[PDB]
Design a protein around this ligand. Structure first.
Ligand SMILES: N#Cc1c(C(F)(F)F)cc(N2CCN(CCO)CC2)nc1N1CCC[C@H](CO)C1
Ligand SMILES: N#Cc1c(C(F)(F)F)cc(N2CCN(CCO)CC2)nc1N1CCC[C@H](CO)C1
Lengths: 296, 301
């Protein structure tokens, strides 16, 4: 096991950088525009790569000129595309991403393209010996749950010296996804999921959702400018203050940067208190830059 | 390839990649939403007039600024899908190929637009100086960078001076945006198109008031054209006889986006085919009418 595997989406992020958020029925010229390789798991691969950690992306891609761009970006970053479930039917998904340059706020208008998701079938064809860690971005829950059981089964037939650490992300407030809570050594729950379930703080959410997690797991919840908090088996709550930049110019992928940084510090054998802190650290550096270049 | 001498209609102006997303409700800042539908279109006045001229059966070229990249590529493949000659494109070293994001609310029907950056440089008179004009029979300039386009227009005037009356490149100019800079373009070309919106800004309540009031701004022997949507279009020439065509509306109105560009291209085509100004006005109103009850330009002819 020498690589980190992120299992999720890869989306073309068509970015427009605005000085102020547009008002409805308004016509307002943008400051600048760019194309960016997106998708939560795809973004985490950019981050992991920049931290110096060898990694691989797993997700569905439809061949064309868009995927040609995406593949070229992944490669320039050293992301192992070898595990991509190439589809015949469907188009590559794209998002219109408006980044408010004044506060760094990002608004995403995603276009889902019928492109079939990576299945337990696609995952079954994967050589689990090259991976140190496996991160799954919560999309097709029932199917991903089968993929989780396949990693768990591999682990049971392996010494503790060679076990695959697993991490899950529950970003979208969807009931299907609450079953993934659930599985994995580390569980990232978003502020939006937490708020939808009735929680007003990262600590409230953590105490309220720790019953849901797998025995021995760490449930992590970041909370924008309020940093992030983690809850382990020991019952002790852990907290990290955020590392805000003086000028917050781009939050698109900040969470994906947080996730990756937490995964990396844990993969490096550092404490949960240290990992939480490094996640907030690297995520904060990103919010002061456009894109991902210059985070380290 | 070998373009035959005096065969092409050139259109000089904007090409933009319009990304259109139809949504249930308008997205609130910092949220992640999913659109109902999403389209990638090739926009721009000179760009749309080129599509229409191809469908009309005319050899046509586009001259506009583009930066090598992925946006330029999608835009070049749409031009080619529509038989437009992209050989005269002014490829830029710096700047972003124009791309706009449109958000259409399903309920109210309101259009929210995040216009392309001002980063890419427009076509210059030095860019235009390098063009061997002999393949063109008509050149249409969309009003943008007026000072520069004036020199372009002067070069065609210079070119024409040494040509017999039948080897003379006919010229048309479009003043569609209410910008003072553009009002100098009125004194150029054989055909001048003025928009309802430009006319309204100058304080004219009809196409009759616009033509009569603005004809003094045009050169000797020029035709000043003004369309007024549902009220059809007018044309006024050196004779002083105000001509009019009533609109030919479709049974149901589907898409008015590019209807002005369809009108412009059809008037240009009909005139370039040797037809009367009355015939051109009629034809432009007919073609533009059929487009309004159609999505895109697919079945306009
Ligand atoms: N780091 C960071 C971070 C920052 C900060 F500038 F504070 F750095 C701002 C922010 N914003 C979202 C809410 N906006 C509301 C405006 O009214 C402000 C911008 N989101 C952050 N993220 C989101 C991923 C996880 C990461 C965990 O620390 C927290
Ligand atoms: N036929 C026709 C016609 C109709 C209608 F179907 F209602 F009759 C509506 C309409 N518009 C209304 C909405 N405007 C909003 C966007 O600016 C665009 C113009 N314009 C039309 N014409 C016909 C003459 C030429 C003119 C060129 O602009 C295009």
């Amino acid at each position: 096991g020498s690589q980190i595997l992120c299992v999720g989406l890869v989306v073309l992020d068509v970015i427009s950088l605005v000085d102020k958020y547009p008002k409805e029925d308004s016509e307002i010229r943008c400051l600048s525009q760019r194309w960016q390789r997106g998708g939560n798991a795809s973004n985490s691969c950019t981050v992991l790569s920049l931290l110096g950690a060898p990694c691989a992306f797993m997700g569905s891609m439809a061949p064309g000129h868009v995927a040609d761009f995406l593949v070229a970006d992944f490669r320039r970053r050293g992301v192992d595309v070898s595990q991509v479930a190439w589809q015949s039917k469907g188009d590559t998904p794209s998002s219109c991403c408006i980044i408010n340059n004044s506060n760094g706020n990002r608004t995403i208008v995603l276009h889902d393209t019928s492109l079939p998701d990576v299945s337990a079938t696609d995952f079954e064809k994967v050589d689990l010996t090259q991976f140190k860690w496996i991160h799954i971005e919560g999309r097709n829950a029932s199917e991903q749950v089968k993929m989780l059981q396949r990693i768990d089964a591999h682990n049971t037939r392996q010494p503790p010296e060679q076990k695959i650490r697993v991490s899950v992300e529950v970003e979208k407030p969807r009931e299907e996804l609450f079953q993934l809570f659930g599985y994995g050594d580390v569980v990232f729950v978003s502020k939006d999921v937490a708020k939808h379930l009735g929680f007003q703080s990262a600590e409230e959410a953590l105490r309220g959702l720790y019953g849901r997690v797998r025995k021995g797991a760490v449930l992590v919840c970041a909370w924008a400018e309020e940093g992030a908090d983690a809850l382990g088996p020991d019952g002790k709550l852990l907290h990290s203050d955020a590392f805000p930049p003086p000028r917050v110019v781009d939050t698109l992928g900040a969470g994906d940067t947080f996730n990756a940084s937490v995964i990396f510090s844990l993969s490096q054998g550092r404490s949960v208190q240290e990992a939480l802190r490094f996640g907030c650290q690297v995520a904060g550096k990103k919010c002061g830059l456009q894109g991902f270049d210059g985070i380290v």
